[PDB]
């Protein structure tokens, strides 16, 4: 026996780590942090290729279990293509004369991490860019757009006798997002 | 029935070798400054994770 | 760098060639005239961006500042991260019924032939409006900005108290001590809701970028961790060594308080 | 989500229907927060190879390109005899 060596019993630790220096070069050239390979052998006398043929053996006269703890960190933005938060479909007017023609389109937003109000501005901007490329040059006016995203409570200042908004302007307060 | 084993390690039995060598690189610097080949010190531990003093 | 070299060798303050911005150029673009009708680019922050002139580029091979910019590689284990002007195809910034060719103080906007586009290119325009299968979008990825620049793990060692875990060698070299526990380095991002840094106030390309409505700063938070039960040596010496190292097995000079508490108990007989 | 308390985006300033919507007094933004999770004890294979595969997938079983740090720690112990 050599005084620096001793056998192991009853419990230990195994580490699954995604940024070992040698594993980066020789194992994970085409991978990413969601799906990768790593070595559980922590002995630098061997390369990862050599380590792949080695084993760790738990005594076969017992059945073993393992308690698992994980650590994860992400950097996802809220408006992106992969999660289908990038696009929507709508039907707008393509031609006036009066005979009116309508058609369906798919609209695309640029990617980023935005607040809810800023997101609603981008959706309105997408509608208008369709009215400047088609539409406007085919006789539609800027009073027949037909799709808008708002936040106001129309009919707030309504009067039960005259049945009109007496102040002459709709109340300029936010209540809940809305479709007009 | 509770042991845990690593495939690169195994225990030793019945016989082995010990080497007594007079020109190890680390022993020259730290052990034998005032000695000669007729009377010197050497390490029988052949594991370079440790210095001769350790 | 342009004031120490450059300027004294004939370069003008219209050929700088590298700038970091936050704006979405071509926001107010018109599909018929193909120019920015308002005459000024929209002054709102969207995502950090890189703007380049021909012959220039940036290289992040030995830097962690690409994490703060929110630009990453789709194959993160391949060494090398360079972005050159030739890789930003399709991302030319639209100019300015005629384009404006110079600024208020007579600085060239670098307008090109066909009088619609400018020589400046930007990563964000190429990612969002360029060719999906040939532009910068095919091998880079857009992510949220990370102000901490990306935190990694830390390792604990107690070589005179615990037994070595399986496959670790016994040693006295500090960068190779056996590891007894792991956790994240305890630094986190926090969000809030809201002239040497403006040397070209007139120039629409070289103006100081607008600030985001969301600001993030990094904080140090004390960490309290339970590492579970580990096998203990039968004889414990009176003096003990305590070590904390990072992912590359260097000690960390920014630790200023570290304590450990151990509670022994019997595991098995003999 | 986190809460706080508070022109290309206004092309028809005069029109009461097409005016730019008012902003809410409550603004929400999305954040990424590191997650530390205990998954309990699971049965372990008796022989473990030196190279291991680690995978994280979403509800449709696609990998997620927005993960940039993932670690695991396993603590073996005996469950039963034979």
Author numbering:
A (entry chain D): 52 to 148, 171 to 253
B (entry chain WA): 48 to 101
C (entry chain Y): 203 to 298, 364 to 461, 478 to 553
D (entry chain D): 456 to 461, 478 to 553
Task: Recite the paper's sentences.
Adenovirus-derived nanoparticles (ADDomer) comprise 60 copies of adenovirus penton base protein (PBP). In the ADDomer, the PBP monomers spontaneously assembles to form a pentamer, and twelve pentamers organize into a dodecamer characterized by high stability and thermotolerance exceeding 50°C.16–18 The PBP monomer folds into two distinctive domains; the jelly-roll fold domain which is located in the core of the dodecamer and assumed to be responsible for multimerization, and a solvent-facing exterior domain, called the crown domain. The crown domain comprises two highly flexible regions, called variable loop (VL) and arginine-glycine-aspartic acid (RGD) motif-containing loop. To expand the scope of ADDomers for new applications, we engineered ADDobodies, representing PBP crown domain, genetically separated from PBP multimerization domain.
To test our concept that a selected ADDobody can be reconnected with a jelly-roll fold multimerization domain to yield ultra-high affinity ADDomer-based super-binders, we set out to graft ADDobody-AH0, derived from human adenovirus Ad3, onto the jelly-roll fold of the chimpanzee adenovirus serotype Y25 PBP to create a chimeric ADDomer, called Chimera, displaying 60 copies of AH0. After two-dimensional and three-dimensional (3D) classification and 3D refinement with applying icosahedral symmetry, we obtained a 2.2 Å resolution structure from 377,978 particles, resulting in the highest resolution for any ADDomer-derived nanoparticle structure to date. The overlay of the ADDomer Ad3 jelly-roll fold and the chimpanzee jelly-roll fold domain in our cryo-EM structure reveal a virtually identical fold, with an RMSD of 0.49 Å and differences only found in the N-terminal region of the jelly-roll. In the structure of the Chimera nanoparticle, the N-terminal regions comprising residues G47 to L59 of adjacent PBPs are observed to undergo strand swapping, stabilizing the interaction between pentons. In contrast, in our previous cryo-EM structure of the Ad3 ADDomer, we observed a hairpin conformation of the N-terminal residues, and the interaction between the N-termini was stabilized by hydrogen bonds between S61 and the main chain of E59. In our structure, the penton-penton interface of Chimera AH0, the N-terminus of the PBP forms an anti-parallel β-sheet with a PBP from an adjacent penton, involving residues 50–54 and residues 106−110. In addition, polar contacts are formed between R48 and S113, N49 and D61, and R52 and D110. Chimera AH0 was passed at concentrations ranging from 0.325 to 1 nM over immobilized ADAH11, revealing strikingly low dissociation kinetics and an estimated avidity in the picomolar range (~200 pM).
